[PDB]
Amino acid sequence: KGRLVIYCSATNVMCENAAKTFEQKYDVKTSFIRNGSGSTFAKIEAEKNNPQADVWYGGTLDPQSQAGELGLLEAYRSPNIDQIMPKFQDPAKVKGNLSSAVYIGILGFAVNTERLKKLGIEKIPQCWNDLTDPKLKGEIQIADPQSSGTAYTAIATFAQLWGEDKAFDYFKHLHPNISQYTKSGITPARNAARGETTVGIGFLHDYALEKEQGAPLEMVVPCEGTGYELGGVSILKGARNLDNAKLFVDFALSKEGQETAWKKGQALQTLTNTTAEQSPLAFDLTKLKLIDYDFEKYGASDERKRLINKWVDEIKLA
Ligand SMILES: [Cl-]
Secondary structure, eight states: OOEEEEEEOSOHHHHHHHHHHHHHHHOOEEEEEEOOHHHHHHHHHHTTTSOSOSEEEEEEHHHHHHHHHTTOBOOOOOGGGGGBOHHHHSOSSSTTTSEEEEEEEEEEEEEEHHHHTTTTOOSOOOSGGGGGOGGGTTOEEEEOTTTOHHHHHHHHHHHHHHOHHHHHHHHHHHGGGEEEEESSTTHHHHHHHHTSOSEEEEEHHHHHHHHHTTOOEEEEOOTTOBOEEEEEEEEBTTOTTHHHHHHHHHHHTSHHHHHHHHHTSOOOSEESBTTSOOOTTSOOGGGOOBOOOOHHHHHSHHHHHHHHHHHIIIIITO
């Protein structure tokens, strides 16, 4: 049935498994080239007069939205969009499904229950505001917003949850309980897993992997609500293999295509297709208390710079 070239921005393992599973189902000779979302965006833009791939799969949706704005993508609404929550059906800036959401990374925190059992604390924290408990002094970690996008997602989430003023009040009250602002977004997951801290804040699928490997972690989607990142799929405008690109978007949005991502592809993000079985270490998306994250507003470089600078000035250095 021909061939398909994928620019993949997910992991190598997830990409390889998607290519193999797609090729098996549809008998399309499928290959991928893996690169980060930013590098991939630059490549697609550079190659726009003679595109070298058919589809862009995985990684954050925001750069795919920006490519849609620049006329680099081909709009196509898969019938499987019917199986995605209205909220996530057409999430990018230019409407018409130039891009679609294939998974979601949920911001939350996880608690080391063994270490909790040593702090004299009997109940597992279930809310963001539980983390200001003075019993948790020196027992929480989150990444440094200056060096980590994960921590910036936290800032933007709190700002959308409570307004910017109360978000920074919350950071001020959380601050005395933070033992380390880590350089990397994922470090609090490794540290909470090993008992180097009690609570780590970050993307829940990272804590899930530590739990999979045996760490005594309880994952929490905080009670007040929370934010997230989305994974995207998009067809390139001028794709050499447009028919097969549409089949691949169908597949990436399908029950089987999304299930295989965690069943064999080692991905632990929550799936956007509401008919899909979730990993036992992921979540039931329709039941989650999620803000509607405004990526257009908070993804702008000037707003991001401003909010990080405010965090530095008022939290880190005040
Ligand atoms: Cl099922």
